Scaffold this active site. Structure first.
Site, PDB file in Angstrom:
ATOM      1  N   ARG C  51       0.824  -1.205   0.000  1.00 15.33           N
ATOM      2  CA  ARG C  51       0.000   0.000   0.000  1.00 15.33           C
ATOM      3  C   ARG C  51       0.861   1.259   0.000  1.00 15.33           C
ATOM      4  O   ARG C  51       0.523   2.255  -0.651  1.00 15.33           O
ATOM      5  CB  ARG C  51      -0.944  -0.025   1.209  1.00 15.33           C
ATOM      6  N   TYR C 103     -17.759  16.999 -13.960  1.00 18.60           N
ATOM      7  CA  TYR C 103     -18.244  15.628 -14.005  1.00 18.60           C
ATOM      8  C   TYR C 103     -19.185  15.366 -12.835  1.00 18.60           C
ATOM      9  O   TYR C 103     -18.933  15.807 -11.709  1.00 18.60           O
ATOM     10  CB  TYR C 103     -17.043  14.676 -13.953  1.00 18.60           C
ATOM     11  N   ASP C 176      -8.830  18.638 -13.949  1.00 21.10           N
ATOM     12  CA  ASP C 176      -9.205  17.291 -14.367  1.00 21.10           C
ATOM     13  C   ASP C 176      -8.990  17.192 -15.875  1.00 21.10           C
ATOM     14  O   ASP C 176      -9.776  17.733 -16.660  1.00 21.10           O
ATOM     15  CB  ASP C 176     -10.651  17.007 -13.973  1.00 21.10           C
ATOM     16  N   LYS C 201     -10.366   6.138 -18.433  1.00 14.15           N
ATOM     17  CA  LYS C 201     -10.724   6.593 -19.785  1.00 14.15           C
ATOM     18  C   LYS C 201      -9.554   6.470 -20.720  1.00 14.15           C
ATOM     19  O   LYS C 201      -9.150   5.353 -21.006  1.00 14.15           O
ATOM     20  CB  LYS C 201     -11.306   7.988 -19.679  1.00 14.15           C
TER      21      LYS C 201
HETATM   22  C1  LIG Z   1      -2.949  -4.496   8.431  1.00 16.02           C
HETATM   23  N1  LIG Z   1      -1.775  -4.202   9.286  1.00 16.02           N
HETATM   24  C2  LIG Z   1      -0.463  -4.625   8.720  1.00 16.02           C
HETATM   25  C3  LIG Z   1       0.070  -3.522   7.790  1.00 16.02           C
HETATM   26  C4  LIG Z   1       1.568  -3.254   7.921  1.00 16.02           C
HETATM   27  S1  LIG Z   1       1.974  -1.575   7.568  1.00 16.02           S
HETATM   28  C5  LIG Z   1       3.556  -1.243   8.272  1.00 16.02           C
HETATM   29  C6  LIG Z   1       0.482  -4.992   9.845  1.00 16.02           C
HETATM   30  O1  LIG Z   1       1.498  -5.673   9.607  1.00 16.02           O
HETATM   31  O2  LIG Z   1       0.221  -4.627  11.013  1.00 16.02           O
HETATM   32  C7  LIG Z   1      -4.213  -4.096   9.135  1.00 16.02           C
HETATM   33  C8  LIG Z   1      -5.131  -3.137   8.684  1.00 16.02           C
HETATM   34  C9  LIG Z   1      -4.946  -2.314   7.434  1.00 16.02           C
HETATM   35  O3  LIG Z   1      -5.488  -2.936   6.282  1.00 16.02           O
HETATM   36  P1  LIG Z   1      -4.742  -2.659   4.885  1.00 16.02           P
HETATM   37  O4  LIG Z   1      -5.263  -3.673   3.888  1.00 16.02           O
HETATM   38  O5  LIG Z   1      -5.054  -1.262   4.414  1.00 16.02           O
HETATM   39  O6  LIG Z   1      -3.256  -2.815   5.100  1.00 16.02           O
HETATM   40  C10 LIG Z   1      -6.279  -2.880   9.423  1.00 16.02           C
HETATM   41  N2  LIG Z   1      -6.542  -3.535  10.556  1.00 16.02           N
HETATM   42  C11 LIG Z   1      -5.683  -4.467  11.017  1.00 16.02           C
HETATM   43  C12 LIG Z   1      -5.986  -5.206  12.300  1.00 16.02           C
HETATM   44  C13 LIG Z   1      -4.521  -4.751  10.318  1.00 16.02           C
HETATM   45  O7  LIG Z   1      -3.675  -5.691  10.806  1.00 16.02           O
END
Ligand SMILES: *[C@H](N[C@@H](CCSC)C(=O)O)c1c(COP(=O)(O)O)cnc(C)c1O
Ligand code: MET
Lengths: 384, 385, 384, 386
Positions: C51, C103, C176, C201
């Site tokens: 991400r 839009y 945009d 698009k």
């Molecule tokens: C995900 N947490 C991961 C992300 C690591 S970032 C340094 C972790 O290792 O703790 C996570 C989220 C977030 O969801 P995403 O798909 O956006 O990453 C939300 N809630 C929990 C409990 C997570 O563990």
């Protein structure tokens, strides 16, 4: 003075096989169907047929002017499947400058199974008719050839081959694509491609394509597509069908850039000789205009000097990438003696694959940048 | 009393070929490399000859087979055709009499047209197998358990007989068992081959073949034919199959548990003529199964009581099992081999092999056991009210 | 007399971000890295979580940035997601000035969602100099403009808007640029702070990826946007990034074809006896045509026109189209047709000019003559 | 003595949304529909608003949560942000004091800028939760077990307290457990939310969020924001996640068995100060875990003895566990939250929550148990040689 461009080509490349009414969703783009099997309660098994491959095959058939098309896991797999049409005791006549992989398969593999392989300069009528025997079942030609771009009169070949009875004429149309050459309209029985090159055009799919009109020939090929199972992934089929949607605008730019590269090279003082079907200097240039609507981005040339000068030139290119394969959006350069035909030497010499032979796949970059890259790299070599 | 489970299988299925140090990003999962070509000026040159995602898959599968090498192909049949190209005109192939229909069809109608001689023999018996071996024999192709009657062949005994006569290749199509339950190379086979379309990928969304081997010269000839015949898999399919491999151990264990439960239910059902499941003591080679396998799969073959139409009524009354060909996926499938898969084997041969009008083949999936049994229960009662 | 074409555009679309030296394999096409996580802290600073950043997305962003003439680019899960992320740059008490005919999705988000979180939204006809500057207050932090507008294609002087906005201090001007693509218009070269796209698009151009793109030059603005890309997580799939980057490789030859087909369609429609009015930036009849030529290098395939007659005639025409497909969205290789009153802007609105006879065409890459014939026969079916 | 496993879970994970009759081809696996738009005349019109592959996934996840509806998003954080857009300026959010660092950061530094008031409360003592509720409270966000200290919250008790105060939404971030082991909607939650990036997809190759809900008006409000904010997942990612769901039951059971073995090995190891695993009797909420869960996952948290130096030596010496963030995949991962995933949590809140220099979080994968134990054994001995 080329053959007029094929009508409805762009329209059919975008719409044939892509009918939204095929899908419950009415999606304008066909979904990617990975499913290996199907509920019976149409399709039964992915290898035998699946929606995404069928859509691609229908599209390619229209672009070839064909009734039918069969997709395969690679160009070589398409070649192998076509050869399985025959039987022990049959004879194959193959062009002496075919693609290296085609030559290797016929010589070292197909010859192991009761098939007699004869390599003939199919540019000469005396040699082709002398090679045809009652056992001849297949004539394999490529035009223009990879990598020296010898050009074969397809309709003349078909006339000679088809008065001798039950002989299949295959044209490997990889270098031209169906936008510039339609072998089936010229008398060929099979139009074959490495879709790995121009057809997909995005350097991210290995695939072969085989287009045919004859009904019995189609049924025999369809049987071998399923029974040998050298089938493409439905995802690759989707990606190739996606690439087809820009084939017309891609090939026109390959023509423009390829012609400009060829003309620049031919007037360059460090270039010994240029081979490009679009140049009047090409020995079969008039035949090219008679049987093609245009020309591709493949430009072959000999640099002046020795192997050392070819190496300095190749290592100073900054936009052309030193790599094998061709037909993609990106420009590629390659020295066939060391990169493809490194195992071949005496056959090299008759075919002109020398230390100074260089093959360019001219891509879709800005023309001025491609010419400038070649200019500075040639000045770095500056051979005598 | 099965063979002890193969050590480190799950660890290797998850890690072999997947080393993050291979990639500049140190990605924990190997990237999908679609590129057909590679910059030169060492490593890769052209995708058909080799590419990162395929090489990672091949390395993983080789480890799971106990093999030094593995080659991936566009389909199981493509793997079969590539193996057969090892031979030459005048050679003889011995094939198991009960084999997958496509294998039988390829040898009988295609390979025989190119100077190859084909003999179909019941390789579960030694008198008929040694009578078929000639000086020209170069390839022995067996499946165990066979598709679809699930005859079981003593792989090590077969290998010992085959390897006495000199330079003969023994292929075991291990599609039904997977390397989690059976390692043909550990039992003396020269080639362990799969339709990866089935259990190996396990998700009914990849057509692929796999070929594992130890012999150096045999590997070099196969590697030559992989590139020269070009029946290669998509790098995306390689990724998907390698992804499926990461759950092969927990999938096969559930196939075993569900498959055993289905087989026992069918065997005690008053509307079932006979059940063929390697995990049941009633299987004629059950003891041989325990000596050469660590467990059994979800493939359950049985004969329904009555006639051809009772088998059809049963199949069309299923509401959880899906009427379709193929096998080895997470979803339960049902099929009548005489009309659907082994319809390409001639009728006279299918009657000799017991592929009758009432034979039904189940691919038991990963659904809840109770739901699978209830679907079979209601469908059998519908066929016999 | 359009702006000269942006130099090196085709070369950069094919090469920027695609450096083979990034990968141990030296692949000429960047691999698709699906991995969510990356090994850290090994002997011998890299990626940590998909991400926050991943190779395939980073390659796309570098390519798009170059095509926009930008230092930086951020990819998002959709054009709307990009819009929502940009708005999160602000805080309660800030004011947003938005064009009165943006839009619909932009309008809906500002009016019904953003206004609930302490943001004051003002809709102004930004084509008028005094109306725009009178709306600017010390609280104004964002000015959102679109040019040409969707779907009536009103054209805004980008440089004039930026000049007026930037006299007032710390205000962000977003353009945009979905309708034109960076091949035909560069808002950042014209004074905009952000060039935003629905890559759904033209950018992707193959009707198979939903994506937003945001290009910027300002350093602090990029860091604030990069924080929100990771912290709000409206990120695109790496596969979609690959597909969009693939589509970029033909953007120049596609857009050139959209221009040629669009010009022919618009010119054909304007001379048609059953068309009341044509709105196409490439036609001299467009009210801002001279301004289009001053700030654009060309024009796209989007053609807006009013049919003569009533709603029933618009329906009969659309029903009779055989090649144009009745569907929403735009910018793909295939031609689409749409009646905004029933399809997009359904939930008067004549003040913006979306009447019962308004039809919007997305002219695709099919053969020009086939498209003109399709329109001809469909127009003859209406009013026979 | 856990809750009985949810009936038909595996059957539904494999079949819900996957009906072959949906497709003209009758494919047993749903095709991947990339198409952005659809020909008009009775279903789809634009991919962002809805598309076949995403809709199939959403139906599958809804059934696995025991829910009527589910909405898929581009990430777990995107799901969190979309849920928060249900509110308005002047609303108050109550968030669990120990949450994923990104959840903490979003509420603290972003949502607070738009007229939203954020309160971090230890909802594990539901007495503190009831004191924090004001008439302005509209959202209560909890995780159980929490990331990374794995504090466990009585969901049903929490729901009872939250719902007597009127119109308040209770979200349970169910990422750590998956719906195979915990069904927050059956326990009174209004929303069951996931980072599908972790266990749901389970193959470390998809970033995605999932939101399951029963309330009709709440679903319509969420569906509007899914389309209007556009934080939507790729149809290919939806296909991959739906594929991963087909093995969720057999994956989670192996995570349970491996996690228990890892947790028991660590707790009896002389170089481990403390182990936090919901499946161990030593976990402070272990009995509550058995009453609201059918089992436990592979997330194992522990404190190594010694200092930061020992935590670093241990992590750098692992051979099978990979030093990396994220969790829930087939591969075993190890991480130091204070420096890696919760470095965004303020240091003061970190020490108050016990996210110290010796805190280590493991995501125990599906490898052979003995190989996992060997790796932990040698790495702990590297930090503390015999
Ligand atoms: C995900 N947490 C991961 C992300 C690591 S970032 C340094 C972790 O290792 O703790 C996570 C989220 C977030 O969801 P995403 O798909 O956006 O990453 C939300 N809630 C929990 C409990 C997570 O563990
Ligand atoms: C070197 S193997 C691939 C060869 C490639 N088809 C070429 O001719 O460039």
């Amino acid at each position: 003075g080329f053959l007029p461009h094929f009508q409805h080509f762009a329209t059919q490349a975008i719409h044939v096989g892509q009918d939204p009414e095929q899908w419950t969703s009415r999606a304008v783009v066909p979904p990617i169907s990975l499913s290996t099997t199907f509920k019976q309660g149409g399709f039964n098994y992915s290898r035998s047929g699946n929606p995404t491959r069928n859509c691609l095959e229908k599209a390619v058939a229209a672009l070839d002017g064909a009734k039918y098309c069969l997709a395969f896991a690679s160009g070589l797999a398409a070649t192998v499947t076509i050869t399985h049409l025959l039987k022990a005791g049959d004879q194959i006549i193959c062009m002496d400058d075919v693609y290296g992989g085609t030559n290797l398969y016929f010589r070292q593999v197909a010859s192991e199974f009761g098939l007699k392989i004869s390599f003939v300069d199919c540019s000469k009528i005396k040699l082709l008719e002398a090679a045809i025997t009652p056992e001849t079942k297949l004539v394999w030609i490529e035009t223009p050839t990879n990598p020296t771009q010898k050009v074969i009169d397809i309709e003349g070949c078909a006339h000679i081959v088809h008065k001798h009875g039950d002989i299949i004429l295959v044209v490997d149309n990889t270098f031209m694509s169906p936008y510039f050459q339609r072998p089936l309209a010229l008398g060929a029985d099979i139009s074959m491609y490495s879709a790995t090159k121009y057809m997909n055009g995005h350097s991210d799919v290995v695939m072969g394509l085989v287009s045919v009109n004859c009904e019995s020939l189609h049924n025999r090929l369809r049987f071998l597509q399923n029974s040998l199972g050298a089938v493409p992934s439905p995802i690759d089929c989707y990606l190739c069908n996606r690439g087809l949607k820009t084939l017309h605008v891609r090939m026109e730019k390959h023509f423009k850039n390829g012609m400009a590269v060829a003309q620049f090279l031919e007037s360059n003082p460090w270039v010994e000789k240029v081979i490009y079907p679009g140049l009047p200097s090409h020995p079969q240039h008039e035949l090219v205009k008679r049987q093609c609507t245009g020309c591709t981005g493949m430009v072959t040339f000999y640099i002046k000097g020795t192997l050392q000068h070819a190496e300095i030139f190749l290592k100073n290119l900054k936009l052309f990438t030193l790599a094998v394969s061709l037909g993609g959006f990106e420009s590629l350069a390659e020295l066939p003696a060391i990169m493809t035909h490194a195992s071949v030497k005496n056959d090299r010499d008759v075919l002109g694959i020398s230390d100074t032979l260089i093959r360019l796949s001219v891509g879709l970059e800005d023309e001025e940048d491609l010419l400038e890259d070649l200019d500075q790299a040639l000045k770095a070599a500056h051979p005598p």
